[PDB]
Design a protein around this ligand. Structure first.
Ligand SMILES: C=C(CC(=O)OC)C(=O)N[C@@H](c1ccccc1)[C@@H](O)C(=O)O[C@H]1C[C@@]2(O)[C@@H](OC(=O)c3ccccc3)[C@@H]3[C@]4(OC(C)=O)CO[C@@H]4C[C@H](O)[C@@]3(C)C(=O)[C@H](O)C(=C1C)C2(C)C
Ligand SMILES: Nc1nc2c(ncn2[C@@H]2O[C@H](COP(=O)(O)OP(=O)(O)OP(=O)(O)O)[C@@H](O)[C@H]2O)c(=O)[nH]1
Ligand SMILES: Nc1nc2c(ncn2[C@@H]2O[C@H](COP(=O)(O)OP(=O)(O)O)[C@@H](O)[C@H]2O)c(=O)[nH]1
Ligand SMILES: [Mg+2]
Ligand SMILES: [Mg+2]
Lengths: 426, 440, 67
């Protein structure tokens, strides 16, 4: 069919990647041993997109696990679905990256990238018609941030006409203590603006706020944050994994969502979200468009929507979905740019998630995403103002010009979002 | 002799082709395995239905059709569907990667890899014809294959089959069932590129069909299956003159003479009646007068526009079923006294009538009631330019910001092709204004 | 009248052949122009990426010098 190759890099990348494979394996009826045990042929119709079929009627994720230290991938292999992954697709070093983008991008990460590229080629060469790649990683560390973006550039060199998609976890002081994350994130975003086609912005600040304020979790853990991510990743990949008319492949999704090449950073959302200590189509619609349900710490009412994709899951009235989707658009027409007519697209999938009878997934390309990049830029400049902690990076051969260039590119990206937010038709 | 080759391009063209060929088989008594127990001419013949069906020595009646799509999943349903035995595998052509709702990919990047094979297969069908009359091309405006590959195919057909007639059934986009933001781009690009290569194009506004299904068939949320069964009835009415013979039967090319006054002005407005549920038809017998009156209700048009705000250049009535000229003439006389029908000053005001006697039929399990008589009106009205205006306006909104244009340039297209296409549409709109201004 | 009759049908033949010829040449130009444009865009992309590869080697070379 149209195969996707999945890559997970670094600690965060491998942990959210493992949770993604657990969730969609349950949806497609695949057990930890790779055998199908579902009850619906719809589970197998597009299984080729993410799984290879091996000997013995077993399904193996088209997934590559990358890290510069063995720790996280050891726990994945010893995890719930650790036995489903191809053992030859574990590629790891020993030196680690020390939360250093330069180490991931230029030194230790560059030492290992050729070994990762070897397994990418084997998975791609066994594809009937490869459509592209999806990468899971964080931007605040060293391996997922530095080596992840190095992988993106090197893969793009060998597959320049394929779609590059990432799930990029943005750092926040509410989750991580390390001080150099604004540096690592700014250097990474500079790469993502140039070399990816579509990026889901998974903001750890939004994940924390949802767990704390909405879910009433006093001390959110990484498991709590990743629980939100796996539900979101299952939602935004539903159109790729099940028969459907809308955004059924990575390229059609990109053509619908990206009106300008650099503005390809999506705000994802999910509904319902409520604490455990306590549903209609109209309520699903209003929640999915509410700022509290967004996985990027941005208020969409502070900007305007370029494009939106909405996916409803479960058994429900399509007529009601159609009415409510046009209802929210007409009532909030100020927040959708008028010079992109019919910029909101809606899909409905009959098979709902495990524990819910109805759910909704939101994918927004909003100019309000600049609030996320402004937050990172503010933290970057507060440190770069005083050349703080730079020796970790210049010691690997980097020059200060590369920081200045990365900062200017992200400020340029912010200016671009504001330009199209202010643009008018008449 | 007088054979017609149908070409179905992309998902919309293929799925509509499925509906049309299923309906044709029911109208002609052709079984899903291609056998036709009424056709005593085994392996050949010059019957009227032979314009659309060839015949093998084993008695199979094979559609003179090619199905083409740049991805396989839609045509794969034909290969395994109820009418799989109807087609030979060579008539069903698929690639592995579609045009991604991008005209540039259907016309250039992906389409160029399969165009030669498609032409070879069309040539195989043409070689079996003793007097090929032309082609019928089914496609969407909005899809990357329906827009881009169709225009490439139409360009190549003009080279390989000179001026042999090419007619279109084109699916005009509607937001209720649209899948791509860039459909206005694809629509303008393919309309510009195909304009000089098409002799006659019947546009089908998905929103008009959607509204008819909701209003007349009580369907809450019509699907493509709902839309395509209605569309196939309209297509069948238009092609009925080619597939059946009779003494009141007027050939489509004779209607075409009246419908195309200038080469570019070749977009007839189709209106069809009656569209009625079985629960409503069970009481009423709708007369010739009632179905004829319904042809002048704008709610029954296949393209949303207001002919009361334009001028007519031609009016054709294609009846099928239990209809005699006496009742047609009385119905037309009533219509002219009570209806807003203004012609341009340079064309005759009469109505051209054809009657095909075999009654219409319906696919089992459908929503349309089986009626004793139906009618399709084909009019050439300046009001159909309203459909171009709506598309041109959505084009202008996005192109002024160059929104999504990088997807087309990335596949080798130039910005000049956008403006060249848009200027051709502007001239076409001005052409429709000019034809409707009184002489001096 | 006979010579006018032959001139009419010769004109019809010439117009049809010229329509075929011009449609053939225009399509050949479009496909060649499109092929050149798309290959030029891919080449610009790969050259930008190769500029990044050399920069990765200057960084590694610069780290080695400061040891
Ligand atoms: C895979 C897992 C868990 C895991 O092991 O990951 C590997 C999973 O959760 N999948 C689900 C899914 C969703 C979309 C696509 C695919 C799958 C689903 O099918 C399910 O089971 O939801 C779970 C999730 C819940 O925990 C819970 O949320 C949380 O407390 C929580 C804590 C931290 C982070 C996130 C949530 C959940 C919420 O979250 C959801 C998702 O609904 C939150 O607000 C939502 C409203 C729900 O009513 C409410 C409140 C529940 O009360 C409900 O009783 C329940 C269900 C229906 C749980 C209590 C068991
Ligand atoms: N009436 C009708 N319209 C359809 C059908 N299928 C698709 N469409 C319309 O066609 C347009 C989308 O084009 P498609 O035909 O699906 O795309 P395609 O030709 O296959 O081209 P690509 O998939 O981009 O390669 C939208 O306006 C749809 O509403 C159908 O079966 N019936
Ligand atoms: N949501 C989420 N974020 C994580 C997880 N693990 C690490 N992070 C974030 O990732 C950043 C650290 O990057 P890390 O993955 O440890 O660096 P690397 O392993 O060298 O690539 C911090 O900002 C963390 O908040 C996780 O499991 N879930
Ligand atoms: Mg860590
Ligand atoms: Mg298609």
């Amino acid at each position: 069919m149209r195969e996707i190759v999945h890559i997970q890099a670094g600690q965060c990348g491998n942990q959210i990647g493992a949770k993604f494979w657990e969730v969609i394996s349950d949806e497609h009826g695949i057990d930890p041993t790779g055998s199908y045990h579902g009850d619906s042929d719809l589970q197998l119709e597009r299984i080729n997109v993410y799984y290879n079929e091996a000997t013995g009627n077993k399904y193996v994720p088209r997934a590559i696990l990358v890290d510069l230290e063995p720790g996280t991938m050891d726990s994945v292999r010893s995890g719930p679905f650790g036995q489903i992954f191809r053992p030859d697709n574990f590629v790891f070093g020993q030196s680690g990256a020390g939360n250093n983008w330069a180490k991931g991008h230029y030194t230790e990460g560059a030492e290992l990238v050729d070994s990762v590229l070897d397994v990418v080629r084997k998975e791609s060469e066994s594809c009937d018609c490869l459509q592209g790649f999806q990468l899971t990683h964080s931007l605040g560390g060293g391996t997922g941030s530095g080596m992840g973006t190095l992988l993106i550039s090197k893969i793009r060199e060998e597959y320049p006409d394929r779609i590059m998609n990432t799930f990029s976890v943005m750092p926040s002081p509410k989750v991580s203590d390390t001080v150099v994350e604004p540096y690592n994130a700014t250097l990474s975003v500079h790469q993502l603006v140039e070399n990816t086609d579509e990026t889901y912005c998974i903001d750890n600040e939004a994940l924390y706020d949802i767990c704390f304020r909405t879910l009433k979790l006093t001390t959110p853990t990484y498991g709590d944050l990743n629980h939100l991510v796996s539900a979101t990743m299952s939602g935004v990949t539903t159109c790729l994994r099940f028969p459907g008319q809308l955004n059924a492949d990575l390229r059609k999704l990109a053509v619908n969502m990206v009106p300008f090449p650099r503005l390809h950073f999506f705000m994802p959302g999910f509904a319902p979200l409520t604490s455990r200590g306590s549903l209609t189509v109209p309520e699903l619609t209003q929640q999915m468009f509410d700022s509290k349900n967004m996985m990027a710490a941005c208020d969409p009412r502070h900007g305007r929507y370029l494009t939106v994709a909405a996916i409803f899951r479960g058994r429900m009235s399509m007529k009601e979905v159609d009415e409510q989707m046009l209802n929210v658009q007409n009532k909030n027409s100020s927040y959708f740019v008028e010079w992109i007519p019919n910029n909101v697209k809606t899909a409905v999938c009959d098979i709902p998630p495990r524990g819910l009878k109805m759910s909704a997934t939101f994918i927004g390309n909003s100019t309000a995403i600049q609030e996320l990049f402004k937050r990172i830029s503010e933290q970057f400049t507060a440190m770069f103002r005083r050349k703080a902690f730079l020796h970790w990076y210049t010691g690997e051969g980097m020059d200060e010009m590369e920081f200045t260039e990365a900062e200017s590119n992200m400020n340029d990206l912010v200016s671009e979002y504001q330009q199209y937010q202010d643009a008018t038709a008449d | 002799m007088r054979e017609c080759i149908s070409i179905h391009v992309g998902q919309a063209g293929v799925q509509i082709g499925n509906a049309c060929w299923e309906l044709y088989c029911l109208e002609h008594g052709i079984q899903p395995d291609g056998q036709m127990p009424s056709d005593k001419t085994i392996g050949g013949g010059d019957d009227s239905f032979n314009t659309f069906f060839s015949e093998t020595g084993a008695g199979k009646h094979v559609p003179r059709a090619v199905f083409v799509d740049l991805e396989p999943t839609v045509i794969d349903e034909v290969r395994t569907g109820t009418y799989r035995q109807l087609f030979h595998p060579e008539q069903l052509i698929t690639g592995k990667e579609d045009a991604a709702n991008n005209y540039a990919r259907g016309h250039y990047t992906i389409g160029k890899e399969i165009i030669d094979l498609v032409l070879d297969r069309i040539r195989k069908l043409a070689d079996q014809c003793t007097g090929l009359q032309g082609f019928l091309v089914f496609h969407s405006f909005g899809g990357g294959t329906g827009s881009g590959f169709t225009s490439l195919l139409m360009e190549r057909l003009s080279v390989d089959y000179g001026k042999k007639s090419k007619l279109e059934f084109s699916i005009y986009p509607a937001p209720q069932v649209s899948t791509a933001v860039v459909e206005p781009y694809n629509s303008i690009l393919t309309t510009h590129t195909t304009l000089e290569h098409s002799d006659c194009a019947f546009m089908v506004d998905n929103e008009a069909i959607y509204d008819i299904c909701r209003r007349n068939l009580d369907i809450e949320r019509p699907t493509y299956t709902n839309l395509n069964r209605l569309i196939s009835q309209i297509v069948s009415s238009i092609t009925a003159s080619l597939r059946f013979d009779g003494a009141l039967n007027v050939d489509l090319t004779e209607f075409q003479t009246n419908l195309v006054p200038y080469p570019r002005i070749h977009f007839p407005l189709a209106t069809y009646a009656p569209v009625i549920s079985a629960e409503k038809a069970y009481h009423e017998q709708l007369s010739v007068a009632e179905i004829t009156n319904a042809c002048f209700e704008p709610a029954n048009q296949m393209v949303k526009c207001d002919p009361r705000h334009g001028k007519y250049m031609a009016c054709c009535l294609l009846y099928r079923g239990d209809v005699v000229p006496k009742d047609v003439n009385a119905a037309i006389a009533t219509i002219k006294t009570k209806r807003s029908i203004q012609f341009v000053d340079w064309c005759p005001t009469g109505f051209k009538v054809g009657i095909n006697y075999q009654p219409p039929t319906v696919v089992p399990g459908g929503d349309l009631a089986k009626v004793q008589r139906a009618v399709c009106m084909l009019s050439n009205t300046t009001a159909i330019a309203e459909a171009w205006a709506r598309l041109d306006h959505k084009f202008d909104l996005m192109y002024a910001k160059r929104a999504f244009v990088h997807w087309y340039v990335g596949e080798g297209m130039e910005e000049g092709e956008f403006s060249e296409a848009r200027e051709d549409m502007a001239a076409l709109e001005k052409d429709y204004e000019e034809v409707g201004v009184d002489s001096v | 009248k006979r010579e006018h009759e032959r001139e009419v049908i010769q004109k019809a033949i010439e117009e049809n052949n010229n329509f075929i010829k011009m449609a053939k040449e225009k399509l050949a130009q479009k496909m060649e122009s499109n092929k050149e444009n798309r290959e030029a865009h891919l080449a610009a992309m790969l050259e930008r990426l190769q500029e990044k590869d050399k920069h990765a080697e200057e960084v590694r070379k610069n780290k080695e010098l400061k040891e």
